[PDB]
């Protein structure tokens, strides 16, 4: 699965750099877009993201594993768009930041696997029709 591998690489590299706080062909352009759009979503939805993080109660490895299981039903209302996808990835970046502060940095990779698993499992057909990561870049171009 070239799409899962590419998406995992994009989401994991984005979440790992957001936690660390330092920035590390199609995937290259997608990452640049995700850095701009993602940081923007985290900045404008910081209060909503704080409430969601407090509600989930992430303190250890198991809490990330429970978040991994509940993740498969995030888009249950049948509304699909790039905005909803970037909101999940941005919230994932927000939870990745919190994981670095609670000394649980090893939890960033399974969190990235779970976010990617849900996008590619429940939204594969949609993502493929949308030209995947090329589509993501073209949609957010300004």
């Amino acid at each position: 699965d070239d799409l899962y591998r590419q998406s995992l690489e994009i989401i994991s590299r984005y979440l790992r750099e957001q936690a660390t706080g330092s920035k590390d062909a199609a995937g290259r352009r997608a990452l640049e877009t995700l850095r701009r759009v993602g940081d923007g979503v985290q900045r404008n939805h910081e209060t909503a993201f704080q409430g969601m993080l407090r509600k989930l109660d992430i303190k250890n490895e198991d809490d990330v594993k429970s978040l991994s299981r509940v993740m498969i039903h995030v888009f249950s209302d049948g509304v699909t768009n790039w905005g909803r996808i970037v909101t999940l990835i941005s919230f994932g970046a927000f939870v990745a930041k919190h994981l670095k502060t609670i000394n649980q940095e090893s939890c960033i990779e399974p969190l990235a696997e779970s976010i990617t698993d849900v996008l590619v499992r429940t939204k594969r057909d949609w993502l493929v029709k949308q030209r995947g990561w090329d589509g993501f870049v073209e949609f957010f171009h300004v």
Partner: single-chain antibody, 228 residues
């Protein structure tokens, strides 16, 4: 100035090869999907091929599969069309067109290049009216095209290249008067001109993406005449 300019057209014998180029100016080429659309003399618009920004997703019309190869060189702001095993049915003006990322509308078109080798959506062939009158043009599709995706309308004045008139069923780009309006209902769509003007005498085409064909499907076009 945001422009596209096609090159490479000419006379070729059946079975021959020809390579078309499309030069992009005034925009970040590497962030847009690009398409080739052709038009046989006196006939409708036919989508040929499309290529995504990073070349990861390529699509072809059934009528050119295996003979045409689309490619792009982002470093040269260029789009290409390699045409092999050319047939008389390939004679047409070939247009380069830019696709909007958020809507999939073809917002910028080149002037076209003539290649001389020697319809899933339906529309009434003609429509007419007197100035000031209201005219309506329908576009009939099905579940996998108009029933699943948005509709775009293009206007082509005689001797000109097509221009984007409506996008996302009823949205007007800048420069399109409020007299034009669009609507979508079920698998049907319609274009309304409320108060016909002299400049509205043109050919009108509807277009939508087809999920089953994995292709862009254009309507056969409607020739609008403004009597008197």
């Amino acid at each position: 100035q945001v422009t596209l300019k096609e090159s490479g057209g000419g006379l070729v014998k059946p079975g021959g090869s020809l390579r078309l180029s499309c030069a992009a100016s005034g925009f970040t080429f590497s962030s847009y999907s690009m398409n080739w659309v052709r038009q046989a003399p006196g006939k409708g618009l036919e989508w040929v091929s499309s290529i995504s920004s990073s070349s990861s997703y390529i699509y072809y019309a059934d009528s050119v599969k295996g003979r045409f190869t689309i490619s792009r060189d982002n470093a040269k702001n260029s789009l290409y069309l390699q045409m092999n095993s050319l047939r008389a049915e390939d004679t047409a003006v070939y247009y380069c067109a830019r696709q909007v990322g958020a809507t999939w509308a073809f917002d910028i078109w080149g002037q076209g290049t003539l290649v001389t080798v020697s319809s899933v959506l339906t529309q009434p062939p003609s429509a007419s009216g007197t100035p000031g009158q209201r005219v309506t043009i329908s576009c009939s599709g099905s579940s996998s095209n108009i029933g699943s995706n948005t509709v775009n309308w293009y206007q082509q004045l005689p001797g000109t290249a097509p221009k984007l008139l409506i996008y996302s069923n009823n949205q007007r780009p800048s420069g399109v008067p409020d007299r034009f309006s669009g609507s979508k209902s079920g698998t049907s769509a319609s274009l309304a001109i409320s108060g016909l003007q002299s400049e509205d005498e043109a050919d009108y085409y509807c277009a939508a993406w087809d999920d089953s064909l994995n292709a862009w499907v254009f309507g056969g076009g409607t020739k609008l005449t403004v009597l008197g």
